[PDB]
């Protein structure tokens, strides 16, 4: 209720995509999942998050964030992240994939470098993108489905069922550290991807020698009116000053989803926490500790910046949209059988569809040869195709002679013209012929033209 509505809709959409402690049977269930590695319970919570045990099955980590501009790299929701933070297991996840192949028993008992003498993949082996998980050879001509991911994955579990058909279920695992392009968010729908992995020696630091794990830009916090993120950082820092109650027990800070306590009560709570920690402070230092403002120093010149920076800890979430899950490239590959253009899928190694709006953009650029070479079939797939000028269909080569069968049955002998069109064009024309529409093409026998010299023309004005 302290942010705007669309940010709450986006936050409810992104909370279900945050990586958590997904299952207790992480090493047992052969199933797809992403698991958080060094989980931390949230502390600035509601009671409904405690009683549903979502807080116990932790969905993020507490990191140190700075709300500043880091050399203009933080622009358009890009975040700066620390390399030493990532190396120490910071927001580290594990992706577990399930592979299931169904082999004939004669194919199983009959690219295989990771297979053992059992015909199955070796435990704790890392599968590369051309590796088969079990032996499948059909009469040689092996037809085994192969590993097709961009990254390697360690074989965690193999479960084999012998029946009329061999069923092999392999659970593989991979530790994914934050790389460039990995999506992250807060509990306030402040999301973005990794723009730069900075070393800890090129990051700004405070008087205590603490560099932030994440640098978020500060303009998007106040343009999107996400006011509760600042209160969450203030309350997280006030917990880190005093994490216990007067009995000594770990108590969380109740900041509900729809909060009715004022900000001044939270400021008074933070003041009491910071006054319990250090029993006397100057009131400038106390107001800098409550509002989480800090003087940060340029790591290159060891000089402070102009103004104080919003600097503090927050519960930060990793999202399930990784760069290597979306990364696609194709040089050459399979073609579909009917139209003889590239195939579709990412597991199949297909092409990116140059759609119709991209065709509009290349028409609007004035690049006619570019859009011609894009939309036509490849130069490697060229063959001499002849068409009949009378009836319109493709000529045939009987034993070396280009003939038209329809016109040689009709006692004609018409012209045959070589055409360079796409295969889908010929399939479309043949299917329209099958519907009954005869399509007949006419060709330009242009009169031979001659270049003649022209007079001098000067378009400069006369003053």
């Amino acid at each position: 209720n302290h942010n705007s509505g669309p940010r709450a809709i986006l936050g409810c959409a992104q909370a279900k995509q945050a990586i958590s402690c997904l299952s207790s049977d992480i090493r047992n269930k052969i199933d797809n999942g992403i698991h958080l590695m060094y989980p931390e319970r949230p502390i600035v919570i509601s009671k409904a998050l405690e009683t549903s045990k979502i807080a116990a099955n932790c969905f993020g980590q507490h990191v140190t964030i700075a709300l500043m501009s880091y050399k203009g790299i933080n622009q358009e929701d890009g975040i700066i992240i620390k390399k030493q933070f990532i190396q120490r297991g910071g927001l580290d996840i594990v992706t577990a994939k399930k592979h299931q192949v169904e082999i004939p028993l004669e194919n199983f008992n009959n690219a295989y470098s990771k297979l053992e003498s059992n015909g199955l993949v070796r435990l704790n082996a890392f599968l590369e993108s051309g590796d088969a998980m079990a032996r499948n050879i059909s009469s040689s001509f092996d037809v085994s489905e192969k590993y097709t991911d961009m990254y390697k994955s360690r074989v965690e579990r193999v479960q084999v069922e012998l029946t009329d058909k061999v069923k092999v279920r392999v659970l593989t695992m991979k530790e994914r550290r934050p790389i460039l392009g990995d999506k992250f968010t807060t509990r306030t729908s402040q999301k973005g991807t990794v723009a730069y992995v900075a070393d800890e020696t090129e990051l700004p630091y405070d008087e205590n020698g603490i560099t932030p794990d994440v640098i978020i830009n500060s303009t998007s916090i106040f343009s999107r009116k996400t006011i509760s993120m600042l209160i969450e950082v203030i309350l997280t820092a006030a917990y880190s000053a005093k994490p216990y109650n007067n009995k000594g027990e770990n108590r969380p800070v109740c900041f509900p989803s729809s909060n009715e306590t004022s900000i001044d009560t939270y400021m008074q709570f933070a003041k009491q926490c910071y006054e319990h920690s250090n029993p006397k402070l100057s009131d400038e230092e106390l107001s800098d500790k409550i509002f989480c403002e800090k003087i940060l120093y340029d790591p290159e010149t060891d000089k402070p910046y102009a103004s104080k920076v919003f600097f503090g800890p927050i519960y930060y979430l990793r999202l399930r949209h990784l760069t290597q899950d979306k990364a696609t490239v194709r040089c050459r590959g399979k073609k579909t059988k009917l139209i003889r253009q590239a195939n579709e899928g990412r597991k199949r190694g297909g092409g990116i569809k140059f759609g119709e709006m991209e065709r509009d953009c290349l028409i609007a650029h004035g690049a006619a040869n570019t859009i011609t070479e894009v939309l036509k079939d490849s130069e490697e797939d060229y063959q001499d195709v002849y068409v009949c000028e009378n009836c319109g269909d493709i000529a045939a080569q009987i034993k070396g002679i280009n003939t038209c069968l329809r016109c040689s049955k009709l006692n004609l002998s018409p012209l045959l013209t070589k055409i360079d069109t796409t295969h889908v064009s010929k399939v479309f024309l043949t299917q329209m012929n099958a519907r009954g529409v005869k399509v007949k093409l006419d060709f330009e026998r242009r009169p031979p033209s001659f270049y003649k010299p022209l007079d001098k023309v000067d378009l400069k004005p006369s003053f």
């Binding site: 207790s24 049977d25 052969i30 199933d31 045990k53 116990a56 099955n57 479960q159």
Partner: protein
């Protein structure tokens, strides 16, 4: 599943063939859901029943119950809901796994299936409609 209703009736409704299903018993599977997920089985309860068809003619003080066909019993496999702590409603004695909340069904291919709630089509208030102007419709259901 407990049914006792007349199927057909002849000769001025004094002869009738009644179906009769009884002895309905539901038993849980003999494993945990994690063994069903690993091995490949499906976490299904097994229900069995005895179904009897017989013709029943009423005399003045006699009831001629002549057994036509009978069938005593596994009959139906029902998907079993994994509950809180991997505890189904049928296993009355089982150790609570201290983290699982359940609420899913294990498929025949070890696939976890989860369900949403759905708004009914039958309305508890009647429905008003304007077909054409000065023509109205009031549709209700029972």
């Amino acid at each position: 599943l407990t049914v006792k209703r007349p199927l057909l009736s002849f000769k001025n409704n004094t002869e009738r063939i009644m179906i009769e299903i009884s002895n309905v018993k539901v038993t849980p599977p003999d494993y945990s859901p994690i063994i069903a997920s690993i091995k490949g089985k499906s976490y299904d309860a097994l229900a069995t029943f005895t179904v009897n068809i017989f013709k029943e003619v009423m005399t003045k003080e006699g009831i001629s119950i002549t057994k036509i066909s009978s069938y005593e019993g596994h009959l139906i496999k029902i998907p079993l809901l994994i509950g809180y702590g991997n505890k189904n409603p049928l296993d009355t004695a089982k150790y609570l796994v201290p983290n699982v909340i359940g609420g899913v069904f294990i498929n025949k291919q070890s696939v976890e299936k989860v369900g949403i709630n759905l708004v009914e089509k039958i309305t508890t208030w009647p429905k008003f409609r304007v077909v054409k102007p000065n023509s109205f419709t009031f549709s209700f259901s029972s």
